[PDB]
Amino acid sequence: ATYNDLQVEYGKCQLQMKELMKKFKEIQAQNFSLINENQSLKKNISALIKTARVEINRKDEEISNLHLEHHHHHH
Amino acid sequence: EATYNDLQVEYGKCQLQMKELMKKFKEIQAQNFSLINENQSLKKNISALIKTARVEINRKDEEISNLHLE
């Protein structure tokens, strides 16, 4: 009777857990890619933050000391 | 096979595990939307920072050259 309906629902519920579990493993794998890429992108920035500051600082000094040359020369 | 009661019990368990699992899924999926956007933020920051550091290095280099020359 309605027993069979219940057995159908029960079996139906189980297969949706299986499917939700495939989907879960999928996203899970995606997240590991993103975590790995994000952490590397962040290291890239910091390395670029450093190097940019070093170069710009290196440019600022030579510009400054040139203004000291031109002044000293025409003074 | 098994009594009508046993099916009822197992269906009961099955719907509890399911609600539980459905909770872990939506949140890892939320975590998937956040990481993706963050990832896109990082790529845009690395884009702009290169752009900004690139434009400054040149202009400071045009300065120093222009000064050395004249």
Numbering used by the authors:
A (entry chain A): 71 to 145
B (entry chain B): 70 to 139
What does the paper say about this structure?
FLASH, Flice-associated huge protein, was originally discovered as a protein involved in Fas-mediated apoptosis and later in regulation of expression of several genes, including oncogenes. Subsequent studies showed that FLASH localizes to Histone Locus Bodies in the nucleus, suggesting a role in expression of histone genes, and that it is essential for histone pre-mRNA processing. Biochemical studies revealed that the interacting N-terminal regions of Lsm11 and FLASH form a docking platform that recruits the HCC to the U7 snRNP. Our crystallographic studies of FLASH NTD demonstrate that residues 71–137 adopt a continuous and stable α-helical fold and mediate the formation of a coiled-coil dimer between two FLASH molecules.
We determined a structure of the wild-type human FLASH NTD at 2.6 Å resolution using X-ray crystallography. The initial phases were obtained by the single anomalous dispersion (SAD) method using crystals of selenomethionyl FLASH NTD. The structure showed that FLASH NTD forms a coiled-coil dimer consisting of two parallel α-helices, one from each protomer. However, only residues 71 to 137 were observed in this structure, even though the expression construct contained residues 51–137. Residues 51–70, which include the LDLY motif previously shown to be essential for histone pre-mRNA processing and for binding the HCC, are disordered in this crystal. The length of the coiled-coil FLASH NTD dimer is approximately 100 Å, excluding the C-terminal hexahistidine tag observed for one of the protomers. The protomers do not superimpose perfectly onto each other (r.m.s.d. ~1.5 Å), and one of them appears to adopt a straighter conformation. Other hydrophobic interactions are formed by bulky residues such as Tyr73, Tyr80, and Phe94, as well as Met87 (selenomethionine in this structure). We also observed that Cys83 is situated in the dimer interface with the thiol side chains from the two protomers positioned near one another. While the electron density did not provide conclusive evidence for the existence of a disulfide bond, and the two sulfur atoms are separated by 3.4 Å distance in the current model, the structure raises the possibility that the observed FLASH NTD dimer might be mediated by a disulfide connection, which is unlikely to occur in the reducing environment in the nucleoplasm, the site of 3’-end processing.
